[PDB]
Design an enzyme around this catalytic site. Structure first.
Site, short mmCIF file in Angstrom:
data_model
loop_
_atom_site.label_atom_id
_atom_site.label_comp_id
_atom_site.label_asym_id
_atom_site.label_seq_id
_atom_site.Cartn_x
_atom_site.Cartn_y
_atom_site.Cartn_z
N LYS A 147 0.80 -1.22 0.00
CA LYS A 147 0.00 0.00 0.00
C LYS A 147 0.83 1.27 0.00
O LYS A 147 0.37 2.29 -0.52
CB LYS A 147 -0.96 0.00 1.19
N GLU B 90 -6.48 6.11 9.43
CA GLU B 90 -7.13 6.91 8.40
C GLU B 90 -8.50 7.35 8.89
O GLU B 90 -9.17 6.62 9.63
CB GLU B 90 -7.25 6.13 7.09
N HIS C 275 -17.62 -5.72 4.29
CA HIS C 275 -16.59 -5.25 3.38
C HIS C 275 -16.45 -6.16 2.16
O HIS C 275 -15.49 -6.00 1.39
CB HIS C 275 -15.25 -5.11 4.10
N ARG D 22 -5.67 -7.15 -11.80
CA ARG D 22 -6.22 -8.29 -12.51
C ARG D 22 -7.57 -7.91 -13.12
O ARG D 22 -8.00 -6.76 -13.09
CB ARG D 22 -6.36 -9.51 -11.59
#
Ligand SMILES: CC(=O)SCCNC(=O)CCNC(=O)[C@H](O)C(C)(C)COP(=O)(O)OP(=O)(O)OC[C@H]1O[C@@H](n2cnc3c(N)ncnc32)[C@H](O)[C@@H]1OP(=O)(O)O
Ligand SMILES: CC(=O)SCCNC(=O)CCNC(=O)[C@H](O)C(C)(C)COP(=O)(O)OP(=O)(O)OC[C@H]1O[C@@H](n2cnc3c(N)ncnc32)[C@H](O)[C@@H]1OP(=O)(O)O
Ligand SMILES: Nc1ncnc2c1ncn2[C@@H]1O[C@H](COP(=O)(O)OP(=O)(O)OP(=O)(O)O)[C@@H](O)[C@H]1O
Lengths: 474, 168, 168, 168
Positions: free
Chosen positions: A121, A205, A240, A297
């Site tokens: 990330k 975050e 999620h 992908r």
């Protein structure tokens, strides 16, 4: 400019994606080679291919498809030209692409360097800021200090989310509202991140009240030509993990979709992407988007975008793999148009009542529900089928297409009602309840939409006398 | 109010085997004869035709398979034989009545056991690993108890909700 | 499918009494989108005289892709075809952005189908779709009359089924 | 050239029952056993598995049915039991090789017969009326002769090429 015809292709996956690739290759007159594990011997993917070989003999069933040397040895011997990784198993692995490049076998997708650049990330964070769209405020470095959490809670805002790096599980994702909750949340999140996984690179975050994320589909060739397909909607978010997808933007300003297009194209060109690409965003109520990540992908929900523009993605993938440029295929921005609306649902052997706990068993009766605007992608569904307790739990991928959103919803509702899968437990009723909710047909849906509707779980019963009478007779 | 016990029993039967008193008397008493096609009425519009094909043999634990030709299609069902051998040599099912008794919430096979026989177990402590689709659960002990013999043993095929540990 | 307007819906609505403008249907509102091809799958021997054939279906399978719409009339596992009515098994429709693309998709779909036990006419349709003049775009009514090669040319292996017979 | 008779015999055996020698020793001479999986290696490319599920009972004129499952699907096969050959089912068979025997090229029901046995008939004249799915079929007399005795008269079901009249 450079053309190397492909004689045969071997797929390194299982389920519906292998079937899709096999159909696309057979449509082009290309021989097909398939691989399968010992446990997965009764599947239908090995029966629709010209060639089938056993792999991972003594290995564990889940990691049998993860042995690079065996796959390389099988591919090299049978004169294979290219490999399609698919998704889920080895798409993200950079070592597999390098090994395929080393043995002279073509790899369908982006170069291994680009995949590694996507990778973790922090590199994506840096690439977004250096050249790219804005991103949600957060800590670039991983967090391991109480002082760090306290300070970044003091600075930006009180609601913060803990995110775990070097992991795909959603286990590392807890919410903080206040100091007292912040301390204990930090303690448990840090402990579980260090325990369940290896390095505990936790992230801080700010949370967004009603998030609503947009997926944009990116296509590019080897001559620096990039073509975006169009956006997507998957705001239906159980916690999620995706359940339902809508192709057209429900209520999005044309300026915002143009901005997303421009930003995604700029990001793709800056890196130098080479194949089926997928850029994920996150927009706020006030009309402010925030970058999240980039998938390297071909996504599962590609079929839905595949119908609005009537463009075959696997065909373009293989054509780029040979080396043909996009303009020779007649694919440009001006020639792509919107036509209709589409809805995606996945039938899964999960029990929507207790905890969406997956169920295992044997299918006793199966029936199809094809109709006017119904497309069906049967992965493994047939009389007397057995559902594995260790692989994924996807039964059928059902797609409904219509001229408008309510029409598509009605078609999907009638198609789901025609499907009869008795004996193996299923989540059809939850999907029907979701489709019947007036908020869904309204158009505006947020991420916590399922979280605020405990009454969505109607859990309809069935008399089911048909199969109950036979049990007595038997 | 008239018959409490009988009410519950009759409700269970009609929820497991379905609506009775819609078959033939010989059908309800004797059953369908092989290679003979009959008819059952269900509602004003629901009409069904049933034909019996063949009965297989005991596969592994006294379970037979019967092929029924409902309408134009075929329907396979599995039924538990009783006149066959009923000596239990398999792993017994855990008891749901005792909450102290430990059963697997989901089907799976135990790979490793954290506690070897003869060790203390506390609350909120990993005990074993159960194989779900892609997710792993460790069982937490509701009560502290001494372990003597592992009923689940180790690395053996097992299904959901089975006795892995019992405390006396 | 070219217009993407459901005909039965409009038929029922106009039977109700609703006018076309209320339904939202105007001659300036519909437009062409792509091309489509339809083929009728029957049980006619494509060699002797297109003579109907009757029997029992032993193997049935279906092929569904990007541009394939299927309308299963009476085709299913273990079905018996009667000589009293029409001899239609499945109505297969293929849609694509161009004529050759739709033809190739239909050829793939027909190859993916598998009907065993009752002789049928997939091979004749395969020969029709493999003709170069057919793919060119222009055909006439005398087209089948002046090409006596479609009937004769027929590839047929029929292997695996025979093996099951020997074991039984 | 060396062994014509046995070569012709062998050529027809390996056609009706498919290719052989790819099976196991038990399969070739003994055959499969119920409820045990065995493997057949067809070609280098592909390879497939079988279970034998159950064997039904004799139903109609010696046609027992057996239940096989190919890899990933269930199958059904009808095999002619040749061990009984005791009952006389009549239904005379009119071989096309023999001119005297007269058979129906298409199975169906006879509508009417315009010829009485042992009587004066014309050459190339309509003799029977046949019904099709949605067409009328008129049979024309192939040659001139005399019919000795007719067994099947009218109002009964015949299959393809069955003896009703014998011409001389
Ligand atoms: C044409 C379309 O696309 S509309 C399709 C949607 N609607 C239907 O399918 C209508 C048919 N109805 C049904 O199948 C069921 O009654 C449902 C769907 C309403 C749900 O009822 P359940 O409680 O699950 O089953 P019920 O106890 O009524 O028994 C159904 C059985 O009766 C039989 N049956 C159902 N409809 C009929 C009929 N019209 N005629 C005869 N038998 C029938 C079948 O064996 C059926 O088994 P199935 O579930 O595999 O179809
Ligand atoms: C993915 C797509 O959409 S491409 C689909 C089109 N191509 C295919 O289906 C490829 C598979 N091939 C076949 O099924 C056959 O070999 C055909 C279609 C080429 C025709 O061959 P035939 O002479 O009819 O049959 P053959 O003697 O080869 O035996 C076929 C049997 O072998 C078995 N078999 C076929 N492919 C495989 C495989 N990849 N692995 C294992 N067993 C297989 C099956 O039992 C099959 O029975 P089926 O006809 O019901 O499928
Ligand atoms: N700042 C945020 N505010 C709100 N929701 C967020 C935020 N960050 C992530 N999410 C949630 O997480 C999703 C993105 O997940 P993530 O980027 O971690 O990808 P992933 O690899 O699919 O995740 P996971 O590890 O859970 O499988 C969003 O769609 C949203 O539901």
């Amino acid at each position: 400019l450079e053309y190397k015809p492909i004689k045969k292709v071997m797929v390194a996956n299982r389920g519906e994606i292998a079937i899709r690739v096999f159909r696309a290759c057979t449509e082009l007159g290309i021989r097909t080679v398939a691989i399968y594990s010992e446990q997965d011997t009764g599947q239908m993917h090995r029966q629709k291919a010209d060639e089938a070989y056993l792999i991972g003999r003594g290995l564990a069933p889940v990691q049998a498809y993860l042995h690079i040397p065996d796959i390389i040895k099988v591919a090299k011997e049978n004169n294979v030209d290219a490999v399609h990784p698919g998704y889920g198993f080895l798409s993200e692995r950079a070592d597999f692409a390098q090994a395929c490049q080393d043995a002279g076998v073509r790899f369908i997708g982006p170069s291994p360097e680009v995949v590694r650049k996507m990778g973790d990330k922090v590199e994506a964070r840096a690439i977004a800021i250096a050249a790219g769209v804005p991103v949600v405020p957060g800590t670039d470095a991983p967090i391991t200090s109480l002082h760090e959490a306290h300070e970044f809670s003091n600075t930006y805002g009180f609601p913060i989310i803990f995110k775990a790096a070097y992991g795909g599980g959603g286990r590392g994702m807890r919410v903080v509202h206040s100091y007292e909750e912040l301390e204990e949340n930090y303690t448990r999140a840090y402990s579980e991140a260090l325990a369940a996984f290896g390095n505990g690179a936790l992230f801080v975050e700010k949370f967004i009240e009603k998030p609503r994320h947009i997926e944009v589909q990116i296509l590019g060739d080897q001559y620096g030509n990039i073509l975006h397909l169009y956006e997507r909607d998957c705001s239906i978010q159980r916690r999620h993990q995706k359940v339902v997808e809508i192709a057209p933007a429900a209520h999005l300003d044309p300026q915002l979709r143009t901005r997303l297009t421009s930003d995604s194209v700029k990001l793709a060109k800056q890196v130098g992407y080479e194949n089926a690409g997928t850029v994920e965003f996150l927009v706020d109520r006030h009309g402010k988007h925030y970058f999240i990540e980039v998938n390297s992908r071909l996504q599962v929900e590609h079929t839905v975008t595949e119908e609005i523009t009537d463009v075959d993605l696997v065909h373009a993938q293989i054509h780029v793999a040979e080396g043909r440029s996009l303009p020779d295929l007649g694919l440009r921005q001006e020639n792509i148009r919107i036509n209709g609306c589409a809805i995606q649902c996945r039938v899964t052997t999960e029990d929507p009542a207790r905890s969406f706990q997956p169920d295992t068993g044997r299918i006793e009766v199966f029936r199809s529900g094809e109709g006017m605007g119904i497309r069906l992608d049967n992965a493994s569904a047939f009389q007397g089928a057995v559902i594995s307790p260790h692989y994924d739990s996807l039964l059928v991928k059902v797609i409904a297409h219509g001229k408008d959103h309510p029409t598509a919803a009605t078609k999907m509702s009638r198609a789901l009602a025609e499907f009869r899968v008795r004996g193996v437990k299923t989540n059809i009723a939850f999907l029907q309840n979701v489709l019947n909710n007036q908020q869904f047909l309204a158009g505006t849906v947020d991420t916590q939409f399922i979280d605020e509707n405990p009454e969505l779980f109607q859990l309809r019963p069935a008399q089911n006398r048909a199969q109950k009478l036979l049990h007595y007779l038997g | 109010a008239m018959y409490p016990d009988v009410f519950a029993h009759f409700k269970d039967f009609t929820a497991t085997f379905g609506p009775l008193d819609s078959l033939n008397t010989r059908l309800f008493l004797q059953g369908p004869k092989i290679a003979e096609e009959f008819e059952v009425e269900l509602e004003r519009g629901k009409t069904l035709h049933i034909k019996a094909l063949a009965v297989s043999d005991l596969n592994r634990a006294g379970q037979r398979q019967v092929f029924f030709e409902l309408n134009g299609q075929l329907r396979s069902i599995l039924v538990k034989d009783t006149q066959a051998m009923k000596e239990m040599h398999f792993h017994p099912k855990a008891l749901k009545d005792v909450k102290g008794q430990i059963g697997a919430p989901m089907p799976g096979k135990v790979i490793d056991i954290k506690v070897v026989a003869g060790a203390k177990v506390a609350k909120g402590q990993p005990l074993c690993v159960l194989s779900a689709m892609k997710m792993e659960t460790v069982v937490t002990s509701p009560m502290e108890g001494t372990v003597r013999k592992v009923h689940v043993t180790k690395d053996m095929t097992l299904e959901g909700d089975d006795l892995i540990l019992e405390i006396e």
